[PDB]
Amino acid sequence: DEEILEKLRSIVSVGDPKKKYTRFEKIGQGASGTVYTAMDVATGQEVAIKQMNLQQQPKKELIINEILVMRENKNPNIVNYLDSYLVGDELWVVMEYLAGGSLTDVVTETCMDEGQIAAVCRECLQALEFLHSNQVIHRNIKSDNILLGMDGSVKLTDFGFCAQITPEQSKRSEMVGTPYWMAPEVVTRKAYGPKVDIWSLGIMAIEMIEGEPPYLNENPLRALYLIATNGTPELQNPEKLSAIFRDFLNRCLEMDVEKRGSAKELLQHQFLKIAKPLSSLTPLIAAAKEATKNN
Numbered sequence: 001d002e003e004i005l006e007k008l009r010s011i012v013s014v015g016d017p018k019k020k021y022t023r024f025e026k027i028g029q030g031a032s033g034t035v036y037t038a039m040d041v042a043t044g045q046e047v048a049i050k051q052m053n054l055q056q057q058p059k060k061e062l063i064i065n066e067i068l069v070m071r072e073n074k075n076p077n078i079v080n081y082l083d084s085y086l087v088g089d090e091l092w093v094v095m096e097y098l099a100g101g102s103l104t105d106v107v108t109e110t111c112m113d114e115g116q117i118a119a120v121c122r123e124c125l126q127a128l129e130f131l132h133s134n135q136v137i138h139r140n141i142k143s144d145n146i147l148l149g150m151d152g153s154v155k156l157t158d159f160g161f162c163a164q165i166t167p168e169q170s171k172r173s174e175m176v177g178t179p180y181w182m183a184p185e186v187v188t189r190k191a192y193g194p195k196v197d198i199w200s201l202g203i204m205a206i207e208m209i210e211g212e213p214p215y216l217n218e219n220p221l222r223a224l225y226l227i228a229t230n231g232t233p234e235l236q237n238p239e240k241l242s243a244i245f246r247d248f249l250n251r252c253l254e255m256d257v258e259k260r261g262s263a264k265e266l267l268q269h270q271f272l273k274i275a276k277p278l279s280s281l282t283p284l285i286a287a288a289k290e291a292t293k294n295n
């Protein structure tokens, strides 16, 4: 549909971003595109720019949807959308820069304590409570999509996979996500709702405990099969966790969706009573940056 393409072309700003920004440094490179920091020639502001190759995404309505959801759902625990450009066959999305980097680096290079985990979970649940109240389901919660500020701020990004629900159509049915983090109702193609995000948050808490989601060593298709057959995953060493942390995990990773916590309910879970102030996260940031400086 050259209808879709024309809507994309009219959403973006015009001008050359290679002259509106400068000092490009590559900081990441997924299949979803390459990420650079840069500086706004006009403002001084540091920004993150995500370069997304269009020919990779045949369903352009997903790109539109990403930008539209981001601009419409502003929140302190969500990375801010700034602007977008079309540079030939690539879309550039300009976002606020968080200099503390990804929770992925923290969970792979450090051992978080329960108080720090509680703090991260509480900020993530705040983001989810906001989204879900606005009838938005993220569908791609994972450590990779949590960014940290140098003050210990915690923010969600990546609306590339999200869905909007209504009272008329309250459930989705697309098998979308990143396998290791996907709820069993999504993997097995049942109708599902916002609590799929809660499941994925539970898997992210397992990342913070163990360094990886369950089954990361397996290929993605095998991981889907394991999720379909095991349901609620097992920890390598459950006994090292507090009872209240175990209770929280169990409520996030309940097989029965009615029983699984909502974000609003999980914000009042006993485990969050031990959350530390966000300043407690700045040492993890320092450690992660030290560990990854020489990659």
Ligand SMILES: N#CC1(C(=O)N[C@]23C[C@](Nc4cncc(Nc5ncc(C6CC6)s5)n4)(C2)C3)CNC1
Pocket (backbone or CB within 6 Å): 027, 028, 029, 030, 031, 032, 033, 034, 035, 048, 049, 050, 079, 095, 096, 097, 098, 099, 100, 101, 102, 144, 145, 147, 157
């Ligand atoms: N998965 C994935 C992709 C990716 O590369 N994501 C990345 C987080 C990265 N690393 C760092 C490192 N130090 C700071 C920082 N800050 C940032 N603020 C704002 C940011 C923008 C993205 C909202 S990214 N990010 C860049 C790895 C592939 N496209 C998304």
